[PDB]
Write a protein that binds this ligand. Structure first.
Ligand code: ZER
Ligand code: ZER
Lengths: 263, 263
């Protein structure tokens, strides 16, 4: 059944994490906002397809907020993979299908490249390689301003405002606090460290996606890199948060995608 | 400086065309709506950068609506390419830099494939290779419903609704009659006919664009095929009508792209 709890790791981080189901492992890493409650409904669905699903709030974010300051500053996919790895060890997850959007997509690839042996297959979605105009000075302003701004930016990029609002008051209060921390630690340093070099993308299976309704320019490069490299590239319904806006379809893609690599 | 007129070709089409400027030929093929008045400003800008610019209302559309039934039904890029060659011959245009969006883009590629001796360089924009669900039954309904649905869809996909509205009432009155005719003859046949096979794309230079704001899924495959084929691919500001939403940027792109293939 769904287990909800904490575990503190050797690196200082008090992770909030959730688990459900049984079978082969699926890890659901959050996008930059670090809020694993976005995964709630799809988590049940994947699990019920014969999977053990793991997810967690990200370091410094939400209920994982009791963490060391460096674990949410100067963030890269590789920094994040390091922490995920040491968390997976405590949970005895040896090999996993790994999903992530945004900076969490940065993390998928970082793991695919740096810890290939722990990735059965990586599912990155919208790897930041250039930030849009709206983020260029997001780290320069005040917390309240960022929370006001980033809540509308995320809300607009929800891909389904009904479902985005429907995440609820508890979640959006947590998100209100993550927004500022996210701006100070993620936007500048995530795109330039995107592991999309040739030598990152071929050590294990990768199925790349982009949001169906995301404006082409935002992750245009994602599609060209994947095509050039012969990496499976496609879309999913919605935009930046398919697991929230289109939970069923998202959970079907994870299931379908992971399915083809099981042996 | 600008000439406007008609020419009935041996295939029975009564073409409305416009020319302006002097020098190497640039041909601007409309999108599915077939309304060459959308090219008014860009056509002025391009021509004074030292080009003879030609455009036209597409067969059966707008001021070229006096055309035989076959010329606006079961439409493919290749059929459109065939009528346009026939028209180009009668205007003594031997070789041209050619732009086109949508089914215009289809025609650009079909021109690049089957009439390579006529193309200096190809500028396709948003080649339809599949349809969004919004068009899947558009050929099945009555005209007034199509005109109501398709005006909003094109307005929504305009890239800049102010300037779309600013095309004026006379332009939109012609579009009103173009919608059903486009729906009955284009959607079903254009995508399956897309000349995007390997042998279609390496006879003349191709510079491929997709609207910066356009939902990724709409022309996602365009970016894949171009990246796979080593064909230059980029974005333009806006969506489906970059010549309407951003005249100056559009004309700069066309001018500079084509200049680079003069000799
Ligand atoms: C906060 C989240 C939703 C933010 C939604 C949003 O504003 C869309 C812009 C896309 C950029 C996302 C992004 C970019 C980065 O450089 C680093 C990131 O961690 C993210 C990212 O996680 O986006
Ligand atoms: C009418 C125009 C703008 C129509 C506005 C619009 O519906 C945007 C959707 C993109 C699809 C365009 C399209 C698809 C086809 O199969 C054939 C076409 O001729 C077009 C196309 O020309 O769309």
């Amino acid at each position: 059944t769904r287990t909800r709890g904490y575990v503190t790791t050797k690196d200082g981080i008090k992770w909030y994490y959730e688990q459900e189901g049984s079978g082969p492992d699926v890890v659901l890493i959050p996008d930059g906002l670090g809020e694993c409650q976005m995964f709630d409904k799809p988590m049940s669905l994947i699990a019920s397809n014969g999977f053990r699903v793991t997810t967690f709030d990200m370091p410094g974010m939400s209920r994982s907020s009791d963490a060391p300051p460096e674990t949410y500053q100067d963030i890269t996919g590789r920094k994040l993979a390091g922490y995920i790895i040491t968390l997976l060890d405590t949970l005895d997850i040896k090999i996993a299908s790994v999903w992530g959007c945004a900076s969490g997509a940065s993390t998928v690839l970082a793991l695919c490249s740096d810890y290939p042996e722990r990735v059965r297959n990586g599912m990155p979605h919208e790897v930041p390689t250039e930030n849009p105009d709206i983020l260029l000075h997001i780290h320069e302003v005040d917390p309240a301003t960022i929370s006001q701004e980033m809540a509308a930016n995320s809300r607009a990029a929800s891909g389904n405002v009904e479902a985005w609002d429907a995440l609820g008051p508890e979640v959006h209060a947590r998100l209100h606090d993550n927004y500022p921390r996210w701006a100070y630690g993620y936007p500048r340093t995530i795109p330039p460290s995107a592991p999309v070099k040739t030598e990152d993308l071929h050590k294990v299976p990768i199925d790349w996606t982009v949001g169906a309704s995301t404006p082409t320019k935002l992750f245009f490069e994602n599609i060209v890199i994947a095509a050039r490299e012969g990496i499976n590239i496609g879309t999913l319904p919605g935009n930046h948060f398919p697991y929230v806006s289109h939970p069923e379809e998202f959970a079907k893609y994870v299931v379908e995608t992971s399915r083809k690599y099981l042996k």
